[PDB]
Amino acid sequence: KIEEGKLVIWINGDKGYNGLAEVGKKFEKDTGIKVTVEHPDKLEEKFPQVAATGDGPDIIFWAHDRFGGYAQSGLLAEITPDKAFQDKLYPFTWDAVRYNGKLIAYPIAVEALSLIYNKDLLPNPPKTWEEIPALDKELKAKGKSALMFNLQEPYFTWPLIAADGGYAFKYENGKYDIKDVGVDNAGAKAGLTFLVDLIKNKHMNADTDYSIAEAAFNKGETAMTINGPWAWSNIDTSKVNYGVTVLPTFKGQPSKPFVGVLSAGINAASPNKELAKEFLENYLLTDEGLEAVNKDKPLGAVALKSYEEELAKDPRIAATMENAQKGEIMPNIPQMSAFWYAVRTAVINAASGRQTVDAALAAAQTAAAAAISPQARAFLEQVFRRKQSLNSKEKEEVAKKCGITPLQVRVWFINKRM
């Protein structure tokens, strides 16, 4: 499918899609080419589905960690910016979107979580995670709570979990070791344990999510929250006197948020590749372009040098870059999705008192390191139930959507048939 002659962009629902739509209208003004911006729920999971079959949006926005998986499967077109445009962005953001020596997306924003606090409830933010339980007690006596943040998505709990030892995939030389998952150690264990103790001691609720945490903070019901720059927009409208600062340390170590580089990748099947290139390069990645999105929902730090240095004057931007510096850029290898799924499962099962922190982290290591991830194996299990004989073309398709090589798909199936 993919209608030729226009542009269909997918971007997460928490970003400034309305602002990106504005950039689209401008593009339509100078070119006549219509651009529609959609924000499908779970787009990072949907993209590989439809893209595998040659469908989907012309352009996809998302943290670079998912992109390596997409490009390995042939779903992302290689972008070819010339020397001049390439110079307009920071080299480290370009490296984030480089897979197997190729550039597979245009870097946009450098995202990192920060500690967001209410200056009226709390004159001075806590320097450590350790003092927070005590702060909560002080605040509970006044009918308020110290902290609330999304506990459902690992992105928000990883900073504390990795603070003292956690890591995605062991990195030696220029290659990651996909069998060495760093959730399998004492540092990570202590961090998740601290998290569960906060929940067990009633300082947080195991069910709190993005909406609940945001609602609570924007109402002045909780003293602090943990979120990205995109969430600043709603806090401004709530008229809360907030500040954005460094994340609390744990065991003396800085919280280590995984830095995500929001990037725009071009669908390998798009018949509008030159248009997407032009829209992104000459329209979006300009001070006017980024600002249009920013005004809707803040991008936070950015990849465009010119605009990044203007934003640097904003203390919230500084805080964001502070946290970015203390954390680290996430890997973009195909195994990242299994990593996240693994951690997501661990945190929830541990926070629910279903599994011990230790048993949870051990299974996370097993799940994330599996040659075939649990999700995907499940995908393969479905399908097989429908068709137990793979067509040379269908297998190539299943590989793409699952994120495994055609070879793996083919060997499974044969093993499944023995």
Does one domain contain both 395 and 278?
Answer: no
E strands within 253-313?
258-266, 301-302
Residue 119's closest CA among 326, 316, 322, 256? 316
Q: CA 229 to CA 168: how far, in whole Å? A: 23
For 295, the enclosing helix (H) or strand (E) is helix 287-296
Residue corresponding to tokens 């100078």? 30
Does one domain contain both 107 and 247?
Answer: no
Q: CA 235 to CA 351: how far, in whole Å? A: 28
Does one domain contain both 230 and 155?
Answer: yes
Does one domain contain both 336 and 302?
Answer: no
Are the CB atoms for 291 and 361 separated by under 8 Å? no
Residue 43's closest CA among 74, 8, 6? 8
DSSP 158-217: HHHHHHTT-EEEEEETTEEEEEEEETSSHHHHHHHHHHHHHHHTTSS-TT--HHHHHHHH
Tokens of 161: 């979990």
Q: CA 226 to CA 252: how far, in whole Å? A: 19
Boundary of a domain, candidates 301, 331, 361? 331
Q: CA 35 to CA 267: how far, in whole Å? A: 15
Q: For residue 123, give its domain range.
A: 112-259+332-370
Residue 256's closest CA among 387, 187, 131, 162? 162
Residue 65's closest CA among 111, 19, 20? 111
| CB-based burial, 342-361: b 16+ in 10 Å, e otherwise | bbbbbbbbbbeeebebeebb
Residue 191's closest CA among 294, 43, 343? 343
Does one domain contain both 287 and 394?
Answer: no
CATH number where 172 lies: 3.40.190.10
Other CB atoms closer than 10 Å to residue 138's CB: what's the count?
A: 12
Does one domain contain both 107 and 29?
Answer: yes
CATH number where 391 lies: 1.10.10.60
Q: CA 82 to CA 385: how far, in whole Å? A: 48
Q: Furthest-apart CA pair in the chain: how many Å?
A: 67
Tokens of 254: 């800085």
Are the CB atoms for 332 and 64 separated by under 8 Å? yes
- Eight-state DSSP code of residue 330: P
Other CB atoms closer than 10 Å to residue 196's CB: what's the count?
A: 20
Q: CA 314 to CA 259: how far, in whole Å? A: 19
Does one domain contain both 319 and 235?
Answer: no
Does one domain contain both 220 and 293?
Answer: no
Other CB atoms closer than 10 Å to residue 101's CB: what's the count?
A: 6
Taking each helix axis from N to C terminus, what angle separates 392-402 and 406-417, rounded to the nearest 10 degrees?
Answer: 110
Does one domain contain both 39 and 69?
Answer: yes
Residues in the chain, overall count: 418
Residue 309's closest CA among 284, 333, 287, 281? 287
Residue corresponding to tokens 């971007």? 11
Does one domain contain both 231 and 169?
Answer: yes
Split into its structural domains, the chain has a count of 3
Does one domain contain both 234 and 306?
Answer: no
Q: CA 28 to CA 42: how far, in whole Å? A: 28
Are the CB atoms for 297 and 230 separated by under 8 Å? yes
**92 alpha carbon, distance to own chain's centre:** 17
Are the CB atoms for 10 and 40 separated by under 8 Å? yes
Phi first, then psi, for residue 263 (nearest 5°) are: -135, 155
Alpha carbons within 13 A on the beta-carbon side of 11: 22
Experimentally, the structure was elucidated by X-ray
Q: CA 117 to CA 124: how far, in whole Å? A: 9
Other CB atoms closer than 10 Å to residue 230's CB: what's the count?
A: 20
